[PDB]
Structure formats: structure tokens, C-alpha cells
Design a binder for these strands. Structure first.
Lengths: 136, 386, 65
RNA sequence: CAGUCAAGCGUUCAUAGCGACAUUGCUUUUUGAUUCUUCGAUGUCGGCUCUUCCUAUCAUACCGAAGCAGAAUUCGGUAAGCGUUGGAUUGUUCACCCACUAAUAGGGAACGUGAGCUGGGUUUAGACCGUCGUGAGACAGGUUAGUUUUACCCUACUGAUGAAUGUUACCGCAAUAGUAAUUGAACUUAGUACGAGAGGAACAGUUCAUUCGGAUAAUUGGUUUUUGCGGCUGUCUGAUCAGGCAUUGCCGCGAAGCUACCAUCCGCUGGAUUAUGGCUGAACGCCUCUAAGUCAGAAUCCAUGCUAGAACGCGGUGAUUUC
RNA sequence: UCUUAAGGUAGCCAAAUGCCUCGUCAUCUAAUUAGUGACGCGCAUGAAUGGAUUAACGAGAUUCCCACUGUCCCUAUCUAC
RNA sequence: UGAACAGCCUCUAGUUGAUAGAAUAAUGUAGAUAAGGGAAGUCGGCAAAAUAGAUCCGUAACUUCGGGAUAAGGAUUGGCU
RNA sequence: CAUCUAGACAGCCGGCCGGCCGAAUGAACUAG
């Protein structure tokens, strides 16, 4: 997992490969984050690094606040559209991909999170849990 | 020139050759290292893979994210009617390997196991073991002499047993015969136990226990001729490739001027023998025990058999083994369950499992109900219900 | 464990059977099968889908029980 | 690419790490030299795919040394078992950046691999430009467009039968050949050891995860000729019902089968060793892991386990044709 | 000051023409030998051996963006022959 | 049907010709569909997908004033009374 | 080349010499 991950994240079906675009859930002024790499990803002959719920990925702001634009910066995925299976047995998904901008340590750059987030992400990152209005 | 980008090799080279199994019942190649302290007991069993089903249970590992929380797990239910002991084969150990010395059969053999000795039972004279069952006359002097010789020279004792396949819903009436090694007291104790159990049945609850960590040995699902792309998982060639793309591009360099054995090539996939170790038992049910499909939390009056029966198999009416996870082989196929070859002391295998709910919804689609009573209560009275 | 209720259909959801959907406004739907899920995504009215428990309740189908 | 010597660097000090002036080598992964083979043709760069091998080891295992307090790092030994990536630009090998990672080590196999692909480049003919030419035309100077043919033969490999050893059937053995698992993170140890402070781990344990592999379809997802149900258009059967056609008419749902790190489960433990650290103890009354002897120990080797079962290796057992 | 017959004017350019060259700066990207805009001592641009620009047009060559997707991650299934 | 000697179905007319039978392995040729992402593939969006008819609205830079233009971008669409 | 029962070297002990202990030892170099 990530360097600052506070716990173990059971494998969540990877549904956000490198190059994906996910709406900036937080309120830093960024509109969407464009994934360029995933922390903790493996290596294969042609496998694209892919994200999941709660993964901390290096992302880039393709649209939004100009000072935020045009630089690499860490983010944490908080909503995944690919249905995944919890250990409780249920298959669930959100209606949109969404991540939050953050520093490598883990603290969100934004102040509040719009929309719901995932329980896995909230458990892994305490700051996302604190700034998340509704967790599901 | 060197491979530009490294990549792990496709497939596993220790499972070669990928040919068909010798027979539809995989041989138990190895047996648990016998010790002469515990009482005499079988080291395996024969069953028929009925199918799979879903269960709910509390995970009970401290330090986990799901400790004392519900988990939904897939299990395989194996139909295992009690097996009949029919013969004792003794083994001596020779510098050329363990060699069978003699087999002593039971006096009376069932029809379903006598069928195993013919290919055309319908028109055969059924003379098998006639001049051998006549040898049990005059108090079996030759039989006892043979057993005494087995005790005198027998280092490993295996018992010939067969499944009461007539108890299963399978169409085949020809039973399967298999050698299960006796682990227990000395050779005399083993052969005496087998002689007492001649033409006698052994039930599963006497060889396996709940939370026991077993292995499943069976021949996998055959799939016929298969291309390299699915047989080994090699990368598909680009869309614009002439002469086809579901292939391997380079099958080897110029030198050595031969195709290497380690190159993925088209051939049969499946129908190989596979021994999958470390599957945990979740419930050893009893065939005569109705409502065995319920638990202390469930407490319904449903058996393990789903609604409409296990797909392609039928219902469960004998002792069964509900083992966590998938096992090699498809439904209706015989599978040999075996005790673990090593004392697995891992905390994943030392768990105590108490099933909280056993699914019985129809495997024949997306059924919403567990019992016909539940279905009737939910749907009310239908027009056909009169 | 507990049994849920289909958000579109009303059919009981036993553990692991079906899918869970989280709309953008955090509303939670549970679908017993891809049938109900696809009907919901097509935005058909559960009131108008004949075999639904909502249709049965509205039209008093079997309500004499 | 590696040694040998030591003037110096290294505060102090040659050899912790370096190392000039010199000198001895190795490799054919560069480029040359040659012209021995092929000009009655060996298809010619690169990329994709895939297998194996080498070690001059980037990482992982165990250790030695330090200008090794800790942390980090550097040098080195046994070691190729196991991995060594995703991308921007370029045909590019190469290169340079972005980023992840334990790591993004170097190579070979006719500069591996074109009856495997591609044809971006080069490498015919069309054409444009610049320079050189009076001219036709020239330019590893630039640009654009340019048919990539054949296996059914033999062998090799992958799978599949198969004659006879009295016949036939059942249960076995196991020579041999192959073999497999890999790595990281978090918690805890512990803000402890160490350190003035800044900083700051490990051994054990737990939960997971990466890469790989073998299965399986309870669940979820995909696929739909179940042409199963329903709907819809055009036309046709006088209308209705019910149907035909539209190369499977189209749409919604869709069991079963197959299938997905897009799903689930599982992937074992003993010995002998290398490096290395030790013991006893001489050679050499002292001393020394070494000479005799001997202990612990690596992702090593051989076993356990797993795969196939020699179709000319074998065993046990059953029945063995008379009207 | 040498010298030619005259000594590249107007213009334009690392352009399909610039070896050094992946020129230098800016923009486009996380990253750009690509694209574009500039700079011009231009090996070897340039005036009907036509220079520059140009609306429309183009099965011409090239870059980026939105939509779109099995091109790909990473493959799976169905039908006919 | 429709704008239509487009495509689809039918009438008069003409054919029912193309070696065939059985199974449904790999690889093919042709046709398709794919969850999440959306060119990250590749020399290059090559192949495919996407949009598409009609009515109404709205339509930029530039321009040789003619065009660009179906620019872009939206809404409606059946049956029956 | 040297030391060597006119007590060699080593080792322990006493303060460079002596006590034990008795017979070869130390240095440089050469080639198989």
C-alpha cells in the first residue's frame, strides 16, 4: 500500500488504470485529477498501473485552478466506479470516480469532500475520514 | 540478442506434460507419514463433487480488520457416502521400491464393485471372485494363512475400498475402487482392523473432523485441444497480424535448431490430475440427519441440497464434506479427500469454524428463496397452487 | 448477518447475492440481480413494472392476505 | 571489463574508499582489420511476441570490511534460485526526461526471432527542395507515396492413438525427466537500542499486499442461436390469432456452458552445503577454523510434496471359452 | 581596404531547403528529437530557375483537443464457412 | 415504406444452380458483443466505434464578400382521437 | 648468511640477563 497508509487495505478490484480521469472530490479548486502512477503498484511486461478505492496515486490536474494545474501531486481515490467485493460478500460501486488531492504524508490539501466516499478509503486515511461527510 | 524487457515465464513448467490423466480417478501419490501411536484409521476417502454453495461465518482471527465480523465464503459440497472395505493389500519395501506382496479380498463382493471388473457387465457371466469366495469355505484356511504372511512381511498396509455409488444420484452404477493407507497400530493391528471391517462400511465422520485441513486430489475439467493463448496465458498478438493472432510469435531462436520443451504450444487443456492442499472443512454432515443444512443461528428445516437440486448432479442424501474454497474437478466427478501431509499450525488453519448460514437458493439461476416454504410465504398463493 | 430488501424490486437479498449501488447523492440501492439493476439504470418505474412488489402493492395484487 | 606496484588524495594515515606515472591481462556486448564461406540469393534495421542460457549482481537470501554510534551509504564473498516496469519525443539501438518500485543490472542465442507479425527506417521505379553539375544526372543531405509469396513433406516441439510380451480386467510400484513460488508494506517490538541533539532500526509475532502459478463458477460481471420471453419497424399471409422474410432484422431482460486478479480458493517441510563465523589442535613446545577431525549456517543443492509413468521395467489380484 | 559583371534587395526560414542540431527562447505535456510561435553570420532560403500571404477546396503530409471505442491494460464469449 | 429506377418485403416472370453427409478441437476468414479506464497500444487513432434522416432553434475566427455552414451546439420525432 | 650443551629458538617466572627445557633454529633468496 502507500507509505502513510494507516492499516491494511484488502485487495479491491483495480478499476482506474494509468491515464484515467476522476473528478476532484475535495475542494482545492481542482476539477479533475488525471492519474499518472499508483503507489505500491507492481511490474509486468505490459501491465498498466491501476488504482482502486483508497489507493494513493500520483495524479495531475488537467482542468481547474491554474496554480494547481501543470504539476504532479499525490491524491487518494475516494470513489470508484468499478464494482468491487467486500469481505462481507457484497458487490458495490459508486456512480463516479473521484479522488482528493493530498500531500505524500496523507493530509488533504482541500478542506472538505463533496459526495460520499468509501469505507475502505476512510479507514485507510484518517484525514479523509475526518473530512468525509458521509462514508459508505 | 537479449530479451529487451524481462517478463516472468508463462505457465508452470512443473506440471508438464499437460496430457490427459491416466484414469478418471486421480491416484493418491503420497500418504501421510505413518506413526504407530494413534488408533488405526483410514488416511483418505472417496467422494463425488456435488457442487458449490455460499456460507456466512464470523472471521475469528485477532488483529484483522474483519475480526468478529461477518464474511461470505464459497464452499464446495462433496457427496461422500460410506465406503465399503473389500480387500487388504500388503506392501513390502524393496530396494526397487515398495512392492505389493498379496491382496486378500472379502468373501462377498457387492454388484456395484463387481461391475468394476468388467467392461460389458450386462452380458458377462459375472464369475468374478467365484473360485475365490469358494476359498472362504472350510473356515478360510488359505485366507488366514495369507493374512498371517501379510503380517509377517508387510511394511505398509493399504485397504481396497469402494464407494456405494448407488447411493449417489449418478447414472453410473460401476463403483470406483481405491487403496487407502491405514495409519495406526502395527501391521497386525492394521490387518486385523481391515479383516474386522471386511465387507463393512466406514463413514466419513470417523475419518475426518470439523475444522480439519484436508487435500483434494482429482482430475480436472477437460477442455480438449486449446490454443496457446488460453492454455498458457501468453500475450495475444496485435490485431493486424497475418495468419492469426492467438499464437506465440517466436517459438525459439535459430540455435539450438530445435523447438524447446519450455515453449508454449497448442494442445490439450484440462483433464489432468491435480492435488490441491490446505482446504479447510466447514461441516461434516450426516446423510440421515435431515435439516443438516441449517445451523444454530439458521435453525431452519432445510437440508444442504439447494432448491431444485444441485445443478447437473441431483440432491444430497449421504454424508457430505463442506470444504472451503474450490477443489479440482467438476461436478459428478470422483474426488479423493486426504489428510494433510504435515501438521499445519498456521493461525489461518487453526481457526474454529461455526457456520452462521448455509445457502440453499437455486444454483439454476438467480433464485431469491432458500426453502419452498419461504417462497410460498413471499409469493402468496399462485394459480397452480390449488 | 441480515437479509435486505431490493430497492427496485422488493425481493429479499441474501448475503452476497446481488449488487449495491451508491448514487452521487449518497442514496443507497441494493439490487438482487442484474435484472433489477438494469431496469433501475434504464429508469423504468418500479410502480409500472408488473412483477414488482411496488406494482403489487399499488394494484392490491394478493393484498387480500 | 579485471589485476599487479605505490607517488599522492583521504585532517592524522598508502592501500575504509580512491589512486597518478607505468605494467600484465581477459571478452567479443562496440568499431575496425582481413576477404576463408556464400553473389545458379542464407530475406537486410528496429519494434512486438516467446523460450533459454552466461555473470562482469541492480534488487532479494546469508555474511566479511569501513573514515560502519544509529539511520543511510560504500567496498567485497558465496550466489543467475527469483525478479528487473508504466510512459512523453524519436524508425531508431542509443539517448533524455516523467513516475512507480526491492530494483528499474549488462549481455548471448546467424548483430535470437519476417513461410511469427509490422513496414516506421533503409532499400528500385513517381515526386519536391537545397548544394554540385553546361547537361543527362549525383548526394548514409532532407521530405512524401510505395504488393512482405508457399508448409500438406522430414525432423524438433505440443498434444493423440497404437501391434506384441498367453487373453482380458482391476489395484499398484517408481527408474527416469520436469518442478515453484516471489517480493513489499502496515501494526507491534519502539520513539526503545544507538545518539549530546538532530535523528533513529532490527530479531520474534500479527494483518495484508506485489509478481507468478494450479484450479473452480456458490456470488458478481461479460458473452446470447435457449433465437427463451416481451417489445418495435418495413413488408407479406383478405382482417384477427398466429406467423414468414430483413445473410442471427433491431432493442430490453436472459438461464445453462465457457469465462475474468473484472470473481473465488489454494500454493508443504527435512537434510546436506557455499560464503561466512566457530571448536579441538599440530605443523612451528608459542599461536592459529585446518593439515587429521569437527559445529552452525544462503532465495544454493538433494530430498518431502506435485506432474508424466519407461508405450521393449516390474509387482499383486480376478476371470480364464468342451458341446 | 581587397574584388567582382553584380555582390542576395523586398521578403521568408532549423521551412519539404540548417551539416553542427535533439540549435536557443516561449507554448503545448508529468515528461515532447514531435507540433506551433519567435530569434537568423541562412553548410546550402529568396524573387515568373517566381518570393510572401492567401478564402474555398484535398482518398495529400503533420500536431493537439472533445466525443468515441477491445488499439491496449487483459482478455472472455457467440454465429456462419 | 421512403425524398428516392437507394436499402428492405411482395406480384407477373425465372431459378432453387454452386459435391454432399456427421460432429462443433485448436488456428483461421467473415460477422458481432464486452464490466472499469478511455489511445496509456502502435511509426501513425491503422481497424473499429461514435454522429447520421426530418422539423425548429443557434451558428465563430477568417473571407476573394461569393463562402466558411449541415460550422460548432441543442430540442422534438410513435400510435390513436 | 647467522645463532648454536662456552644452554640455540619458543614458551612461562624473576627483575637486557638469568631459572626451567633439552636440540637444532632464525633471515633473505632460488626452482619443482
Amino acid at each position: 500500500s502507500g507509505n502513510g497508509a494507516q492499516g491494511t487495505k484488502f485487495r479491491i478490484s483495480l478499476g482506474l488504470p494509468v491515464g484515467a480521469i476522476m473528478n476532484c472530490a475535495d475542494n482545492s479548486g481542482a476539477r479533475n485529477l488525471y492519474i499518472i502512477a499508483v503507489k505500491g503498484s507492481g511490474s509486468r511486461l505490459n501491465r498498466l498501473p491501476a488504482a482502486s478505492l483508497g489507493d494513493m496515486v500520483m495524479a495531475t490536474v488537467k482542468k481547474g485552478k491554474p496554480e494547481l494545474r501543470k504539476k504532479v501531486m499525490p491524491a487518494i481515490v475516494v470513489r470508484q466506479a468499478k464494482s468491487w467485493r467486500r469481505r462481507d460478500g457484497v458487490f458495490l460501486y459508486f456512480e463516479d470516480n473521484a479522488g482528493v488531492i493530498a500531500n505524500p504524508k496523507g493530509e488533504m490539501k482541500g478542506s472538505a469532500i463533496t459526495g460520499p466516499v468509501g469505507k475502505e478509503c476512510a479507514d485507510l486515511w484518517p484525514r479523509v475520514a475526518s473530512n468525509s461527510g458521509v462514508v459508505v | 540478442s537479449h530479451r529487451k524487457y524481462e517478463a516472468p515465464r508463462h505457465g508452470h513448467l512443473g506440471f508438464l506434460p499437460r496430457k490427459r490423466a491416466a484414469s478418471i480417478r486421480a491416484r493418491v501419490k503420497a500418504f501421510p507419514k505413518d506413526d504407530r501411536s494413534k488408533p488405526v484409521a483410514l488416511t483418505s476417502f472417496l467422494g463425488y463433487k456435488a457442487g458449490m454453495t455460499t456460507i456466512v461465518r464470523d472471521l475469528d482471527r485477532p488483529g484483522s480488520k474483519f475480526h468478529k465480523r461477518e464474511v461470505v465464503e464459497a464452499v464446495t459440497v462433496v457427496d461422500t457416502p460410506p465406503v465399503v472395505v473389500v480387500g487388504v493389500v500388503g506392501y513390502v519395501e524393496t530396494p526397487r521400491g515398495l512392492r505389493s506382496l498379496t491382496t486378500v479380498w472379502a468373501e462377498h463382493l457387492s454388484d456395484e464393485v463387481k461391475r468394476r471388473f468388467y467392461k460389458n457387465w450386462y452380458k458377462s457371466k459375472k464369475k468374478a471372485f467365484t473360485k475365490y469366495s469358494a476359498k472362504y469355505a472350510q473356515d478360510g484356511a488359505g485366507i488366514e494363512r495369507e493374512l498371517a504372511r501379510i503380517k509377517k512381511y508387510a511394511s505398509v498396509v493399504r485397504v481396497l475400498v469402494h464407494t456405494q455409488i448407488r447411493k449417489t444420484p449418478l447414472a453410473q452404477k460401476k463403483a470406483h475402487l481405491a487403496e487407502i493407507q491405514l495409519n495406526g497400530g502395527s501391521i497386525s493391528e492394521k490387518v486385523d482392523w481391515a479383516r474386522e471391517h471386511f465387507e463393512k462400511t466406514v463413514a466419513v465422520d470417523s475419518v475426518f473432523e470439523q475444522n480439519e485441513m484436508i487435500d483434494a486430489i482429482a482430475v480436472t475439467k477437460g477442455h480438449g485441444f486449446e490454443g496457446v493463448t488460453h492454455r498458457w496465458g501468453t500475450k495475444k498478438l496485435p490485431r493486424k497480424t497475418h495468419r492469426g493472432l492467438r499464437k506465440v510469435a517466436c517459438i525459439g531462436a535459430w540455435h539450438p535448431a530445435h523447438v524447446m520443451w519450455s515453449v508454449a504450444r497448442a494442445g490439450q487443456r484440462g483433464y489432468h490430475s491435480r492435488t490441491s492442499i490446505n482446504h479447510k472443512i466447514y461441516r461434516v454432515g450426516k446423510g440421515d440427519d435431515e435439516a443438516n443444512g441449517a445451523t444454530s443461528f439458521d435453525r431452519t428445516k432445510k437440508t444442504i441440497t439447494p432448491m431444485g437440486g444441485f445443478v447437473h448432479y441431483g440432491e444430497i442424501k449421504n454424508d457430505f464434506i463442506m470444504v472451503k474454497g474450490c477443489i479440482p474437478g467438476n461436478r459428478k466427478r470422483i474426488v479423493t479427500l486426504r489428510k494433510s501431509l504435515y501438521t499445519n499450525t498456521s493461525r489461518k488453519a487453526l481457526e474454529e469454524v461455526s457456520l452462521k448460514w448455509i445457502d440453499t437458493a437455486s444454483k439454476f439461476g438467480k433464485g431469491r428463496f432458500q426453502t419452498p416454504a419461504e417462497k410460498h410465504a413471499f409469493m402468496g398463493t399462485l394459480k397452480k397452487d390449488l | 448477518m441480515k437479509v435486505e430488501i431490493d430497492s427496485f424490486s422488493g425481493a429479499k437479498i441474501y448475503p452476497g447475492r446481488g449488487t449495491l449501488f451508491v448514487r452521487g447523492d449518497s442514496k443507497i440501492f441494493r439490487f438482487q440481480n442484474s435484472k433489477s439493476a438494469s431496469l433501475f439504470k434504464q429508469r423504468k418505474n418500479p410502480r409500472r413494472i408488473a412483477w414488482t412488489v411496488l406494482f403489487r402493492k399499488h394494484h392490491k395484487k394478493g393484498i387480500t392476505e
